[PDB]
Every structure is written in C-alpha cells, then in structure tokens.
C-alpha cells in the first residue's frame with residue numbers, strides 16, 4: 001500500500017507490500033527510482049534531473065558472471081551500503097517480511113542483470129550471509145514482477161548452488177520460505193533430481209548438485225521416490241525440451 005506503484009526504468013511496477021522508505025516517501029502513492037543506483041525520488045522531473053547527474057549504468061560491484069546478455073554482480077553490503085539499503089527497500093515492496101533495511105553489512109548481494117545498449121538492467125537478486133552457522137546459501141531472493149515467470153528465479157537458485165558447489169559445501173535457502181519461495185525451490189529440486197536420474201545415492205546426489213541432504217530427501221519423498229519412477233523421469237524430460245536462461249559454470253569469474 002505505501003508506496004503502491006514505482007517507476008523503474010521503462011517499467012511501471014505495482015508493489016505488493018509496504019516498505020519503510022524514510023518519512024515523506026512512506027506517505028507517497030508513487031515513487032520514482034533510478035534504475036541503476038536505486039535512489040528514490042518523489043517526481044518524474046526530479047528523476048529526470050537525477051538521470052542527468054547519475055553516472056551508473058550497472059551495480060557498483062565486480063561482475064562475477066556474464067553470458068551473452070546476462071550478468072551477475074557480487075555486491076558487498078559492507079562496501080556499497082547505500083545501494084544495498086536501497087535494494088533491500090525495493091525488495092521489501094515484494095516481501096511480506098524482510099530484516100530491517102539498514103543492516104546490509106552482514107550480506108553479499110548477487111545482482112542479476114539483463115544487458116543491452118542502455119546498460120545492465122536489474123532483474124533481481126539473492127542475498128547471502130557472509131558468516132552463517134546454519135549454512136544458508138540464500139537469505140533472500142527476489143525477481144522483479146516485470147521479469148517474473150521467465151526462468152530468472154530458477155537461474156538465480158541454480159546460481160546459488162553453483163557458489164555452494166564451488167565453496168565445497170551443500171547449501172540450503174533460509175527458512176521460513178514464502179509460498180512463492182517454496183514453489184520455486186520445490187520446482188527447482190524436482191527438475192534437478194529428475195534430470196540427474198535421467199542422466200544417471202543421496203550423498204552422491206548432494207555432492208554433484210550442492211543441494212543439501214535434507215532437501216533431496218524431502219523432494220524424493222514428495223515425488224514418492226524414497227526408487228526410480230521411470231514414467232515421471234521420462235515425462236519431465238519431455239516437458240523440458242518443450243530453459244533459455246541457464247547457468248554456465250565456465251562463465252563464473254569467482
């Protein structure tokens with residue numbers, strides 16, 4: 001409800017939840033954000049004056065992944081604090097609960113961009129705690145509405161496990177999951193398991209995949225495979241081939 005709509009580059013985005021934008025922006029139906037620095041402003045003309053002095057065309061961070069027109073920037077909440085606070089405020093417009101927006105230091109932010117001649121456009125992000133005893137490989141994940149349901153969410157989840165695999169660890173998303181988070185991960189874990197079985201132990205599956213034992217076990221249970229169900233494997237393999245956004249591990253500079 002507050003705010004209700006944002007203008008974000010060429011996009012009008014309807015918000016899902018309130019976000020605690022600093023007072024006088026918390027009481028505004030519409031916000032105008034710079035698409036590259038995520039600064040919030042109260043009018044189109046103020047945004048237009050800002051685009052004239054803002055020099056950013058991408059996130060203020062190292063690009064750790066690029067393939068064709070897709071990039072991932074690794075942003076450190078300890079270094080690019082303002083930007084990461086602006087990103088958390090944006091994210092909260094599509095999250096029912098987030099931790100308070102100005103403690104970003106404990107996190108790294110993996111920012112997804114679709115790139116063209118006008119720059120690297122924010123699609124979404126996942127955050128990740130630098131030091132985490134629960135071994136959560138994602139704390140938060142968000143794809144902007146205008147890009148939702150195109151495979152960007154799965155790509156990011158896939159990308160989160162590639163980091164896990166490269167740190168020599170199995171990882172898991174932070175719980176509680178939102179309903180949308182639950183559907184996304186379930187959809188991801190099923191397809192990874194079905195595809196691996198098509199192309200092939202739970203501990204071995206865990207090592208190849210970076211998905212933790214718990215999530216494999218419960219996904220296997222959900223599929224009543226905890227035991228190969230050939231019909232289900234074949235049908236999924238037919239569903240696939242019927243993933244244009246897809247992680248290539250060799251494109252990782254990390």
Ligand SMILES: CC(=O)SCCNC(=O)CCNC(=O)[C@H](O)C(C)(C)COP(=O)(O)OP(=O)(O)OC[C@H]1O[C@@H](n2cnc3c(N)ncnc32)[C@H](O)[C@@H]1OP(=O)(O)O
Pocket residue numbers: 094095138139140141142143144147148149150151152153154155173174176177178179180181182183184187
């Ligand atoms: C770890 C956590 O913190 S949980 C928090 C999760 N994040 C949020 O709730 C923020 C708001 N939601 C979002 O940002 C997104 O919905 C995400 C990140 C969860 C998923 O992003 P998307 O880009 O939509 O992902 P993608 O297109 O890869 O879809 C993944 C699966 O979720 C399904 N899905 C996506 N949106 C919806 C929806 N509105 N209703 C039901 N299912 C949906 C897709 O159909 C797909 O399942 P399928 O393969 O069985 O069809």
Ligand SMILES: [Zn+2]
Pocket residue numbers: 034035036037038039050054055056
């Ligand atoms: Zn800007």
